[model samples]
Target chain A: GSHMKILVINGPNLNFLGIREKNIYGNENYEYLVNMINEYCKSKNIEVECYQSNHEGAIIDKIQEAYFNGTDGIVINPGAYTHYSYAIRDALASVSHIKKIEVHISNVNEREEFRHISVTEPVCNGQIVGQGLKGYIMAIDMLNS
Target chain B: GSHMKILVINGPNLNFLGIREKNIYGNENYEYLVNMINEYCKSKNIEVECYQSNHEGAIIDKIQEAYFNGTDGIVINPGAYTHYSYAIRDALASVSHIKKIEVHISNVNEREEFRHISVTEPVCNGQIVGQGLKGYIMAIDMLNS
Candidate 1:
């Protein structure tokens, strides 16, 4: 039940981040972003833990733990998982005091007409977007507040 | 075609931007944002125009003029239309110089499943979401570059 820890979760195809879609996600890799978040959080004296899973249920399991462990906040970029998945929505909705920020390197609204809706942002404290990897940085600021 | 002007289009209840959706768009009014954008564009000396229409056909007509008149880019918050506007999507594709940015004030993913898909992102240059009114500012910065 640590009240100061922040958990960052990425879902689906994020592991193959660099090679997967150069046009949409740009050139950053999963681990690179993790290291950057780690360094940024280190300077802030905040502990950041990163995890990624391709499966929805597994991601759900992690969020459930976040609730139980009293993780202070969460930053999520659910990838393709953002568009569909009520189980994840339910998990996110159940947690309180967990300020969540949904992040996307690409603006989902400008993508396919089918890609515009997000099931997660309403439950989140706020959203950070269109700054590429800076979305994560802004999420940390949201979490800090 | 004179380097092309930029058009910013908003739709539906967005005319009541400040009063309507505290949960989604925050406290910024539509006219206030337009003034801010206009002021910023003045600095850049880029020709800019904005149109707000609750009707679909008016938006379609505006896009036609933008296509023929050589609009350099577009910034759009297609409002409820983002959900199922094939005509808007087609108009966006018809333009050669227009680079559109799709925007949403709330994190659409954190809400209902229906809010998750945006049909317009495919035809645009990019999108900005979840940052409330600042999303437009960020998109404008990108367009300026």
Candidate 2:
């Protein structure tokens, strides 16, 4: 049984998941994603916390808390912030030795010109995209391994 | 006479101007852009340094030097790094009071989905995109003001 602690951070417009661009992002609500993460972590006996924010500062604050709280891993999907938020990236960089994975539900590379670039990816341990909701699970599996 | 010092940083494939993406990035060589920036700065009596590196670490190092060396401002075209390099963005963020302007010769928004997003833009003072080589000149002008 694993007792690892993981933090899942989502940013900006993710709250509009099912209601927003259902075609590209799929028709699942934010709650579905949260529950998916929770169930997967529970099965593995790993402790996981999910947090979402439309604000950049809030996301940065959460990443910092992961460091201070002794969290073992992070799975982040920065929403639109993935494209332009250096503040969040810096926060992730500031915390060392924590395994971090960036996840995107849609294949951002196949989406709008703006969605393809990921500012936070360089700082993370790895990135998963276009796998729909499975991306988050894959990230956790990677971090656990 | 005000002695202004500005650093122009270019990243990755930008060193291959004419040969890389001729259709979108134009057929001009990298030297042409360097000379243009030099001439513009020289005309304004400003001291300018142009540096290009395919490595992300080197780019971050130069930005740190700018912070410590009292460089007045930065005119940077991070190339592909603009999309995902948070290290460069954090380096810029570390050096407060130094103005930074991100420049792109092509209209990245009109190009590939990957080129449209800029991780460094949020940390930069401003951005100039899609105006060809003239974007660098405009950045310098903005910095001068």
Candidate 3:
């Protein structure tokens, strides 16, 4: 297992983590989540790069970048785009060899009907949802494994 | 409820249905599917209009037209977009007052992993899948109900 590089991608309204749905996502803001991810990477001595996007095209571009930039693995939480964003799915599919995991801060299945579905999971190695910010860490560990 | 205006929307790659997935989507072509939907609508005396597109923007435009043109309900098989097209979902959500049902000729859940989730289902009144060509008929019936 290459302990070198992993990319973390967050999508859509996830930037509003604390501001959008405090009850579902908790009060921890986006920066808090980023700090936790950075801390986790430091502890593991793994190189981690994080990105968040409100636009679908931007997310797709980053995934494509990972494919070209020698990214070993990916951890992604596609926010509302989780339900329906074939463009992102196709982007991930284009680089199917990379170890990728889908992470959700909330239990999507327990939330809205749309949240219950993940169009991106089919192309991912596994998924971690509803574990709050810890889900990101869990995804990182899975990729490392 | 009175027999009203119903629009059926088909999206990307669906035009190649029978040509692409003979075993899964059956040997019936796109025209066959449209005729079936029209036949079903005529049987129920519901005013029906069908539109299909290989482009996402076109689909969104048709949806917006439905919202403005007094389309009473919608039956959509967003094709591959069903998995990841928040733009289409947002368009549907924008016209939440109209009843909409999602239809799939094949059982997406039983097929591939990505096919299992639908981003538009929450905004829709209900979804029908795996019932073959009959699913569209079922959606129309559901909208009528």
Candidate 4:
């Protein structure tokens, strides 16, 4: 909806937001997450697209599309994929032409022992974790700044 | 050829064994790697199959095959994928019914920042790294034990 484009990608069970493990992810629906980003991007005049996929290949496909689709930046909450999806990581790295930040609803580091390792974070400019849904907006600021 | 089967999966540049980075990966060829594992398993009366692939899907495919193949254990050096391949991690974790060990010729923790985070290590029974090619034998011992 604005001059700059930021593509947001979510992976696996993220669609289950507000349905699964509300204690960790909160009670907000996935729509709430998208609308919030939509509203925030509107305030900043940044064009944003939110994409979610349960399959790794589809997520990779979307990330690849961002490169040719004029996506200036990306905010990804790879969900469980953040911990292990190198395919996605490679896709993000290949499109290093854009800015990317990994955001998670919960402080993943404090959750599972596995959640502590983010394979995607190294390639991304920075990670916004433990900040909740607001973290995506924070990532926007970092990339836009 | 033996009672117990241990599948050894090497990923990405591992095929470049002797061709790539002599200082880091050493001077052995991929054939040499397979031969050594072959001889080691022969000594232990363990049937071993060494599979190397540059593609992520092939490695994941091989891992899934282990489930029904009477494969007793796995020793994997996911190569660069170790740092980002969650698909392999999920594959290894899902086949928790087997003994899986991740091995690295170099001490990944001592290398680049990205190499320090091993997404596949946590899913394995343990990680055997920095021990060179002998690390595979050590992994074999671990799973064999």
List pairs with backbone clashes in candidate 2: A113-B113
Specify the poorest-scoring 10-residue window by lDDT in model 4 chain B: B87-96
TM-score of chain B of each: 0.91, 0.95, 0.95, 0.96
Top-TM-score structure, candidate number: 4
Question: CA lDDT of A38 in candidate 4?
Answer: 94
Per-candidate DockQ values are: 0.01, 0.02, 0.07, 0.07
Q: In model 4, what are the clashing residue pairs, if there are any?
A: A84-B86, A86-B84
Output DockQ, candidate 1: 0.01
* Cα error of candidate 4 at position A105, Å: 17
Query: What's the lDDT for candidate 1?
Result: 0.78
Please identify model 4 stretches exceeding 4 Å from their true place: A1-145
Cα lDDT tens digits, model 4, B1-145, are: 2489999999998988899888998889899989999999999899989998887757766876787689989999998988776667766765757899989999888898989998888879988889888999999999988
DockQ preference between candidates 1 and 4, better one: 4
Error of 2 at A134 (Å): 36
lDDT (0-100) at residue A107 of candidate 1?
Answer: 81
Which candidate model has the greater lDDT, 1 or 3? 3
Error (Å) of candidate 1 at residue A30 is: 0.8
Q: Candidate 1: misplaced stretches above 4 Å?
A: A1-3, B1-145
Models ranked on lDDT = 4, 3, 2, 1
Model 1, residue A38: C-alpha shift (Å): 0.6
